[PDB]
């Protein structure tokens, strides 16, 4: 399948080179997989989710996304027009308030929730969790991330937007998950993207168009936008049977575009998410 005039990020994921406009992907599109977007929530009513999105847990008075962030990330995972895995099942877990903030205890709780909740969802092709959030180093947050991964979930987390080594940020610094950096349209490391040895992969993160609340759309930047590309790619690949939740991150790294990014510091992988789709 081919999506013409797709967001640059989608087109980059199905290309060996930057600057293309079509997103090529297998028609299965992540059917049968499930992705938990652990964020500010998901506007499930947005037409772009076509009924494939549902809120399953909130740690606040309401399950509504009063911010937009969570909706945008969910959109990049699986909305019709802006998503990597267009047929995946989206589950919203609101651990961030409407200002985009959340206590670590709450974020930890959300991760444990997903580890248990998946045991009662129908996801024959696998489960993925996308965490476009982060803060200072925390052994407890990292352990929660590691537990979620160990439980059988493909965890993708943002590297952080501090233009620094991700070793000082959580859950970015947890080795066993998939830590994602951001890149721009010209294959440059996003100016704000964290780097370092703990990074596993890069995804499109600068000027990323996706869904927003109020049934709208908008472009924003962050490692937060790169993360759901990798989460969506994992789901896509798991549905195709190419990999599993436990191995998806290294499978994506194995098959990434190599050596294409600029301003990558010594000690950081030069690998960019790639679906290797051959019509």
């Amino acid at each position: 399948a081919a999506q013409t005039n797709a967001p640059w990020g989608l087109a980059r994921i199905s290309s060996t080179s930057p600057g293309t406009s079509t997103y090529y992907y297998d028609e299965s599109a992540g059917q049968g997989s499930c992705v938990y977007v652990i964020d500010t929530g998901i506007e499930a009513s947005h037409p772009e989710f076509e009924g494939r999105a549902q809120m399953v847990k909130t740690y606040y008075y309401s399950s509504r996304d009063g911010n937009g962030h969570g909706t945008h990330c969910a959109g990049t995972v699986g909305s019709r027009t802006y998503g990597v895995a267009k047929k995946t099942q989206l589950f919203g877990v609101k651990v961030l308030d409407d200002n985009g903030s959340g206590q670590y205890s709450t974020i930890i709780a959300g991760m444990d929730f997903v580890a248990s909740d998946k045991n009662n969802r129908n996801c024959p092709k696998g489960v993925v969790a996308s965490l476009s959030l982060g803060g200072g180093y925390s052994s407890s947050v990292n352990s929660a991330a590691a537990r979620l991964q160990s439980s059988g979930v493909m965890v993708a987390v943002a590297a952080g937007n501090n233009n620094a080594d991700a070793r000082n940020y959580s859950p970015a610094s947890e080795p066993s998950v998939c830590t994602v950096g951001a890149s721009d349209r010209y294959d440059r490391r996003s100016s704000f993207s964290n780097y370092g040895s703990v990074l596993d992969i890069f995804g499109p993160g600068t000027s990323i168009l996706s869904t927003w609340i109020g049934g709208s759309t908008r472009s924003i930047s962050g490692t937060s936008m790169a993360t759901p590309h990798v989460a969506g790619l994992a789901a896509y690949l798991m549905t195709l049977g190419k990999t599993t939740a436990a191995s998806a991150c290294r499978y994506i790294a194995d098959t990434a575009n190599k050596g294409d990014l600029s301003n990558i510091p010594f000690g950081t992988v030069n690998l960019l998410a790639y679906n290797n789709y051959q019509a």
Partner: peptide
Amino acid sequence: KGEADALSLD
């Protein structure tokens, strides 16, 4: 716009 938030670590 990007990321989220921190502290406490349960």
